[PDB]
Amino acid sequence: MSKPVLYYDDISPPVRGVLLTVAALGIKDQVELKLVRLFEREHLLEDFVKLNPLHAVPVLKHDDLVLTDSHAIIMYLCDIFGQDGDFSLKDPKQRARVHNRLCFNNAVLFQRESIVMRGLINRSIVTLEDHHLKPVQEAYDCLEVYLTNSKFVACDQLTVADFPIVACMSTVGMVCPLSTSRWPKTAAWFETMKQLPYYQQANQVGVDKLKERLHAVMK
Amino acid sequence: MSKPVLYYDDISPPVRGVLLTVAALGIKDQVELKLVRLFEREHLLEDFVKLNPLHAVPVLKHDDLVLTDSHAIIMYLCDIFGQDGDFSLKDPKQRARVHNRLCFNNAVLFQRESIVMRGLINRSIVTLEDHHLKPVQEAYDCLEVYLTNSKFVACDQLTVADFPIVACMSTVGMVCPLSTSRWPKTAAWFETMKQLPYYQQANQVGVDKLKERLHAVMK
Numbered sequence: 001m002s003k004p005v006l007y008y009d010d011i012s013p014p015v016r017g018v019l020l021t022v023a024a025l026g027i028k029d030q031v032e033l034k035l036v037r038l039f040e041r042e043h044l045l046e047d048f049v050k051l052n053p054l055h056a057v058p059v060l061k062h063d064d065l066v067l068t069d070s071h072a073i074i075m076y077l078c079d080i081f082g083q084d085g086d087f088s089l090k091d092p093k094q095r096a097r098v099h100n101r102l103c104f105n106n107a108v109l110f111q112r113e114s115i116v117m118r119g120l121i122n123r124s125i126v127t128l129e130d131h132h133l134k135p136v137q138e139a140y141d142c143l144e145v146y147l148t149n150s151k152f153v154a155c156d157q158l159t160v161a162d163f164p165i166v167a168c169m170s171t172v173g174m175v176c177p178l179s180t181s182r183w184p185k186t187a188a189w190f191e192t193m194k195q196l197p198y199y200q201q202a203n204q205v206g207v208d209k210l211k212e213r214l215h216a217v218m219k
Numbered sequence: 220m221s222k223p224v225l226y227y228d229d230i231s232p233p234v235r236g237v238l239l240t241v242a243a244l245g246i247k248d249q250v251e252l253k254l255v256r257l258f259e260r261e262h263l264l265e266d267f268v269k270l271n272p273l274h275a276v277p278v279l280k281h282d283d284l285v286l287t288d289s290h291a292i293i294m295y296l297c298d299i300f301g302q303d304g305d306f307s308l309k310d311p312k313q314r315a316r317v318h319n320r321l322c323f324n325n326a327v328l329f330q331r332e333s334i335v336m337r338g339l340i341n342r343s344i345v346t347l348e349d350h351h352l353k354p355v356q357e358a359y360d361c362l363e364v365y366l367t368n369s370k371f372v373a374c375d376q377l378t379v380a381d382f383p384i385v386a387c388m389s390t391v392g393m394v395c396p397l398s399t400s401r402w403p404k405t406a407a408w409f410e411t412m413k414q415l416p417y418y419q420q421a422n423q424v425g426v427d428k429l430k431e432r433l434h435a436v437m438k
């Protein structure tokens with residue numbers, strides 16, 4: 001009927017969490033994309049600020065519904081496209097387990113990694129020291145606990161909560177790489193996620209673009 | 220049958236978002252409380268760290284389900300206690316609208332206000348300057364847009380998304396008060412929230428405790 005429109009830039013880990021979800025749900029053909037290029041300041045145009053006063057990506061518009069957080073976009077796409085499949089959130093406890101880990105990404109992992117990555121990119125951080133990376137390492141410690149108790153981040157099956165987290169892990173991993181000695185379950189989970197058939201197009205392309213910008217700033 | 224247990228300290232805005240939700244849903248007698256006192260470091264005890272490696276409140280345990288983010292706790296309590304009432308999230312678009320504003324609180328308003336409040340309390344900030352408060356004021360600007368387009372934060376009815384946001388607004392308002400000239404819709408919404416019959420017990424008690432600690436540090 002009516003197709004959701006995803007406003008996006010794939011250098012963003014929040015955006016790539018959604019792109020991974022879209023591919024995993026098999027709904028690439030049901031979700032139209034609209035590029036909003038951050039480095040060219042397209043997120044500050046009047047139309048986009050009216051759509052989202054946070055002037056941030058991703059945004060999903062579906063009819064008159066406007067969602068302005070990747071984690072809300074992901075749960076909504078699950079509800080309307082994934083009810084009868086491997087990513088279903090119909091059961092209340094399963095939905096809460098998944099939402100719990102989405103909150104972990106939004107409020108812990110993404111918050112802490114974004115501080116480091118933005119600071120490096122805007123040159124306010126010119127040398128990474130121990131204090132810069134401790135909050136990220138503490139988030140890795142929590143993730144390692146979760147992946148000791150279940151095979152994937154929210155339960156023993158892959159869920160949509162694995163996607164925002166791997167989008168963040170593949171971003172801050174550029175500056176804070178996983179040690180297999182320190183975080184063995186997280187390192188093995190990360191390698192497993194990288195083997196998903198849609199990982200290259202939905203996540204690695206944007207990671208590669210970010211890595212190029214980081215190398216230039218840091219040289 | 221089996222009662223959820225809420226691990227809590229009401230000086231915390233995330234906790235008070237849940238306490239407001241519990242009162243609004245009429246389920247105070249269905250949710251057992253377990254005090255975890257932050258100032259006495261009870262959140263660092265081995266049992267609690269095993270329950271939640273983030274060593275933070277609130278936590279909800281319901282049978283074997285352990286939720287470790289106020290926003291996930293609130294949506295879960297809606298699903299299992301509020302399906303047939305004024306706070307229902309059964310409709311997918313309504314659920315997404317509410318979740319969208321929960322994400323705003325968790326990832327924007329709470330993140331920005333907590334930085335300021337924690338910094339004042341640990342004395343790392345000894346004088347509030349313009350740069351300290353600009354991110355909070357930008358969050359107020361977004362809230363004002365939301366409350367121009369709907370009567371409450373997520374739609375024209377009160378929802379559970381109003382509760383985490385008012386818990387934060389009543390905390391950082393101590394140092395960054397709302398101007399009725401700058402944010403008229405937000406100021407009127409805030410006064411309306413303060414008139415809810417459960418606001419005093421569920422939120423003001425904890426705000427009062429925090430205000431006392433702030434005054435002492437800042438004198």
Ligand SMILES: N[C@@H](CCC(=O)N[C@@H](CS)C(=O)NCC(=O)O)C(=O)O
Nearest residue numbers: 012014055056057058069070071326
């Ligand atoms: N919690 C939000 C975070 C969104 C966000 O911060 N997006 C960034 C890119 S990673 C952005 O568009 N920033 C633009 C700006 O800050 O002006 C989500 O998960 O969608």
Ligand SMILES: N[C@@H](CCC(=O)N[C@@H](CS)C(=O)NCC(=O)O)C(=O)O
Nearest residue numbers: 107231233274275276277288289290
């Ligand atoms: N996103 C979390 C935030 C929880 C949080 O940060 N709680 C604080 C109190 S406001 C805490 O318990 N901090 C203890 C610590 O940082 O060790 C939620 O909404 O539940």
Ligand SMILES: [Ca+2]
Nearest residue numbers: 029031032033
């Ligand atoms: Ca198309």
Ligand SMILES: [Ca+2]
Nearest residue numbers: 037039040041
């Ligand atoms: Ca161009």
Ligand SMILES: [Ca+2]
Nearest residue numbers: 046047048050
């Ligand atoms: Ca225009």
Ligand SMILES: [Ca+2]
Nearest residue numbers: 248250251252
């Ligand atoms: Ca009781």
Ligand SMILES: [Ca+2]
Nearest residue numbers: 256258259260
């Ligand atoms: Ca005591």
Ligand SMILES: [Ca+2]
Nearest residue numbers: 265266267269
């Ligand atoms: Ca013990």
